[PDB]
Design a protein around this nucleic acid. Structure first.
Ligand SMILES: O=c1ccc2ncc(F)c3c2n1C[C@@]3(O)CN1CCC(NCc2cc3c(cn2)OCCO3)CC1
Ligand SMILES: [Mn+2]
Ligand SMILES: [Mn+2]
Ligand SMILES: [Mn+2]
Ligand SMILES: [Mn+2]
Lengths: 671, 674
DNA sequence: AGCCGTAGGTACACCGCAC
DNA sequence: AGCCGTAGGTACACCGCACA
């Protein structure tokens, strides 16, 4: 019994608060009136009774507890006269996931306790916004704002149209995705309460948020918010590859407070993935300690592990503090975070992405960096280049885990339409092992296949006699010798027939279903290969142009400051007189401007100069910096005057990155 | 569960026992899977010396080890059935790891003795400088620790059976006193092949016992803190998380303390901070919390992602003058940070907030006190070092719990203050009142210190259900933010309510005793102290802190005067100063020329070069003269203080008195006599 | 039918001492 | 007994989509 009941046993005047868990529950319990206010803390996202089978709804803990608590029974054994509270209040947290949970609770109430809604017994609390959850609020401010009958504003759930309600719960919570997807495309925007309205607004609120700020990557830098924030945090704390490894608990703590208002496990595990050479084609995090295995083992707890950027991540961040990309307010207006990273290499395609969102998902495979940039260079020289033509550069996916791809037709379809099915195979050979016996040796497995689960799958077949010919199965994999899975073949059995069966019946062959959905200008979009590169190139141009414009403004400010110091150096004797005959700093300022026709800034810079700056070498430093800066100023203006020069520079910086980080193709494309 | 090897030839097969999956992950990635099995355990294992058999055989990890080894236990042990000829204990390289090792060896000795006698039990030797094996890369762990070509495993040898029996009895057994005795005789408060089991258990257990005694479970007498709380407060100070500054995220606080100062689990840090923010736990709260921070009904805090914290105004006094060389700093656990050995502690925190701790061989239980009373005691002591405990009791009347209530009698308090030990009877505040129709009720508005309210309610509800008390018709917790604590016991019409109340005191936590046991760290050793010793040590701390501060401010003032003498010379002769700089090509030359030509020290010459041109304005020459004159008065004031001990002691009195007037409050707990 | 990866959520074993 | 408070350790419920 999680239920913290009230004293009074008079249902007319008793109410029950459904909260997300004990973090909310505590604040709730501390602030309530225990005479008339019961509390039932749940455990987060409840079951979707619209998608779930009947037997499993009834065997579900929180469903049981809610029913037990209400005292009515369910569906047809629902007696409204046995109800123990005339007020059932949904008080989930005031975030998108709170709205989602409320829709899930409503789905449950409408399907199994419909008459409870019809009796006007179901209510929605209205906690203040700007709180991640109720546990973040003090007890008194939760009582006054949300729970005190004297000041609270509860919304009574009313049911208007029964037909229309049915169509709503089926559409939003039902198993058919397309209908949901259609609702989101049609409706997306980039103190009674109608149940139909609440469902539609709450779900859209959740759907949208998961679509544009959680599960789908941005086309420009290929990142989800969590990754973008982990990387930015690493940048902000000077956690570069030349520095030592920093503790993960601080990385996580920092990202969670400043940028990512969600649980630590989502953050830590997203970071861990980026450090794994079998998950990321070009790892983004350089980890120290236990960071997981291909066998599905998780990483060590965050208190043990350490991390920093890889050298390549520096290229994601290069020039972020040179006004290249737009910054936005963080979740609470106390911080600033990047909307997008500079992304000086085409990361989306390089590393790919997979996200399960709402009404849609995404699945992009990784690619070879040498080939992608070559692709970008060709597009840059011909805006009208066909997909076929791009594919002379980018042969197909290139998986961190190597392996084989069967044929080109799936790739082609996927590059042209954004969708397509790519068959992946393990790299396997047949060899002798003595006495006329043979074995199969696997040294590379498909992308995202759990090796230990794959081995168990084979063993299970052996055992069930669903496959013939295998006498032994060993995972000889080693840190020192790499992946090595050995399948011994029964004497005189065709091992090639056995190998073929394994590809038919086990993850030893696996398909990658490409479904290339990314955020293009804030909206989810199914894109082909060209579109993906087009948006990327366009982003590289804005980055380098904005960088060049930044460096200019700053060069011009510094030259202006140096012009002041040189005037000063030229008339040093007269500059001293002016300052020495002045009572206050303000008087000296005004006099320096008047005597030598200096700006307010130049005068300040002169007054701030130390006596040290009068030594021979220091005087020469000022002159030397000034001459170097004039040459730099025109170098910048030249680039700004000519579009082709700019684009050329985007080409030369991409090339430089290709030469330094480009590497061999790993996945073999068999015809 | 077990991650077994390929081969089933036990002669060449080995099993590694690690503390959990963090360690096991690195171990499984680095191992030779042909001959090396891994059994990850789950932290501290059951101590079999203290447990009966039914408890042992139902412990999951014991069972998994038994099943893994395949030999059976006790009388049914069969060495021939061993699945591995090397059992390797490879716990983390920290004191808790040493402790887990001692627990496993205890188990092996009592249940698998022949396993040790055949030389099948080994101890791995992972490098130190790592919290757990999860901190290591799989290759580093293989090469230094598991690889048979470079590793240095320690084979456990049983030399003398009689002596090992006694060793397992003493160190792991239930008679605490012998363990305490063992620690006292051996505590110093300053490997290739074989390893005698007895030595291993002695050195490993002492290492853990010592570490828990001096650096975990016991408070320091000077500032009244344990390492975790000290590092929390220091953390809050270092990031300027003061009362006037906004609330800071708990996750940020904890991650920082965990990273730089306290190399342990997040739980221990957060939950410690949480307690410091609880007005029913701390007589004077050290942390100011925003969000769900728990309750007297035992509700924990909200998860740390939700809560935010900062220091209280009174914690600033714990930290006052910490950056004025008042206390000794030490290296952190890894050498990358500095941390304070002790806080200046400008109020008697040990006694004010109290402490309770379970250590090894000993424990501690010190109740909290009223700050006004404590300071007046301290002041009385400072004017009479020959003051008796009884006379000190005219200032300090007894403990004063954050939860208020009543204390029964003074004799318990007296014994506690005289000896360091004593039982103090604590009672709830309860009244009897009418409720209508000739019926009465008991109403409890205050409960004993460290009693969980809801649990006390459940124990009363249990009594009535079991009919081991009569006259109670109803029981409600009416506690509210508006009302305060209010527990109601409705009595049956015409039943004597006082007799019921009296039974409730005897049969439930409604009256609890506080077993005073005043053990604190004095000069880094655990010591049982009385009330006078606690004050005396605290006052000597204060005298040291104020003395060191005054010495610091004097070195600081004397340095500044010396700079200003060089700035006066410079400004007087500024034209010559400028020409000297201009004619100098480097700083090195400019330094050298200013020092000779103007009779300046290296520090003064540097100060002049660092001087900005704005510093040459007309009214600066006077501003510098005024500062220098005032520094000479200041230096004279400070020397006057260091010259006379009584002026220093008075200075301590004055600051303590100021603390009292600002932070001192009324007594909460009533001491009823008889 | 189960798994991929970002999300909401919480529980329970063990050590130590003392009364 | 089992509870006070620093320590070691880790697991399992839920949503959402698409593909075998
Ligand atoms: O292993 C198990 C097995 C079963 C189980 N059943 C229930 C339950 F609740 C739990 C369970 N657990 C663990 C757990 O306690 C849940 N954990 C609570 C603490 C969370 N991390 C705290 C944290 C640490 C930080 C930080 C932010 N947050 O920021 C930087 C500094 O370090 C992680 C999840
Ligand atoms: Mn929530
Ligand atoms: Mn450990
Ligand atoms: Mn009692
Ligand atoms: Mn017992």
């Amino acid at each position: 019994g999680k239920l913290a009941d009230c004293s009074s046993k008079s249902p007319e005047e008793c109410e029950i608060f459904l909260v997300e868990g004990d973090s909310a529950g505590g604040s709730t319990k501390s602030g309530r009136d225990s005479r008339t206010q019961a509390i039932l803390p749940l455990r987060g996202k409840i079951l979707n009774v619209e998608k779930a089978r009947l037997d499993r709804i009834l065997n579900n803990n929180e469903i049981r507890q809610m029913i037990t608590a209400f005292g009515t029974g369910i569906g047809g054994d629902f007696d409204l006269a046995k109800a123990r509270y005339h007020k059932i209040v949904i008080m989930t947290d005031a975030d998108v996931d709170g709205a989602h949970i409320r829709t899930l609770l409503l789905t449950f109430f409408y399907r199994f306790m419909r008459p409870l809604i019809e009796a006007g017994y179901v209510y929605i609390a209205q906690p203040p916004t700007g709180y991640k959850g109720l546990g973040e609020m003090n007890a008194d401010q939760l009582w006054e704002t949300t729970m005190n009958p004297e000041h609270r504003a509860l919304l009574q759930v009313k049911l208007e149209d029964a037909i229309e309600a049915d169509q709503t719960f089926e559409m939003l919570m039902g198993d058919v995705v397309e209908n949901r997807r259609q609702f989101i495309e049609d409706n997306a925007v980039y103190n009674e309460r109608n149940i139909t309205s609440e469902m539609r607004e709450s779900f859209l609120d959740y759907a949208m948020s998961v679509i544009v700020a959680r599960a789908l990557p941005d086309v420009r830098d290929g990142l989800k918010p969590v990754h973008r924030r982990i990387l930015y945090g690493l940048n902000e704390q000077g956690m570069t590859p030349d520095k030592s490894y920093k503790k993960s608990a601080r990385i996580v703590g920092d990202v969670m407070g400043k940028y990512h208002p969600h649980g630590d496990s989502s953050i830590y595990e997203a970071m861990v993935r980026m450090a794994q050479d079998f998950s990321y084609r070009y790892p983004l995090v350089d980890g120290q300690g236990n960071f997981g295995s291909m066998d599905g083992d998780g990483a060590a707890a965050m208190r043990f592990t350490e991390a920093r950027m890889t050298k390549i991540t520096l290229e994601l961040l290069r020039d972020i503090n040179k006004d290249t990309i737009d910054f936005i307010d963080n979740y609470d207006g106390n911080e600033r975070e990047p909307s997008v990273l500079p992304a000086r290499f085409p990361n989306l395609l390089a590393n790919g992405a997979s996200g399960i969102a709402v009404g849609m998902a995404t699945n992009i495979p990784p690619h070879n960096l040498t080939e992608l940039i070559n692709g970008v260079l060709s597009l840059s020289k011909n805006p009208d280049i066909s997909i076929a033509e791009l594919m002379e550069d980018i042969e197909g996916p290139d998986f961190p885990t190597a392996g084989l791809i069967l044929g080109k037709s799936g790739i082609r379809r996927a590059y042209e339409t954004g969708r397509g099915s790519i068959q992946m195979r393990s790299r396997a050979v047949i060899e002798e092992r003595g006495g006329g016996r043979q074995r199969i040796v696997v040294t590379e497995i498909p992308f995202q296949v759990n090796k230990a689960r794959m081995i168990e799958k084979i063993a299970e077949l052996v055992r069930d006699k669903k496959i013939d010919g295998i006498t032994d199965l060993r995972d000889e994999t080693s840190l020192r010798t790499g992946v090595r899975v050995v399948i011994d073949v029964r004497k005189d059995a065709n091992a090639s027939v056995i190998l073929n069966n394994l590809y038919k019946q086990t993850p030893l062959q696996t398909s990658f279903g490409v479904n290339m959905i990314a955020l293009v200008n804030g909206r989810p979009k199914l894109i082909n290969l060209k579109e993906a590169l087009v948006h990327y190139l366009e982003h590289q141009k804005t980055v380098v142009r904005r960088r060049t414009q930044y460096n200019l403004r700053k060069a011009k400010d510094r030259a202006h400051i140096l012009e002041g110091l040189r005037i000063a150096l030229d008339h040093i004797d007269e500059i001293i007189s002016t300052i020495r005959e002045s009572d206050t700093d303000k008087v000296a300022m005004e006099s320096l401007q008047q005597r030598f026709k200096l700006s307010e800034k130049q005068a300040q810079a002169i007054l701030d100069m130390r006596l040290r700056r009068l030594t021979g070498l220091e005087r020469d430093k000022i002159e030397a910096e000034y001459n170097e800066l004039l040459n730099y100023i025109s170098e910048l203006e030249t680039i700004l005057a000519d579009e082709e020069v700019l684009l050329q520079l985007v080409r030369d910086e991409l090339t430089e990155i290709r030469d330094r980080f480009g590497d061999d193709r790993r996945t073999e494309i068999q015809l």
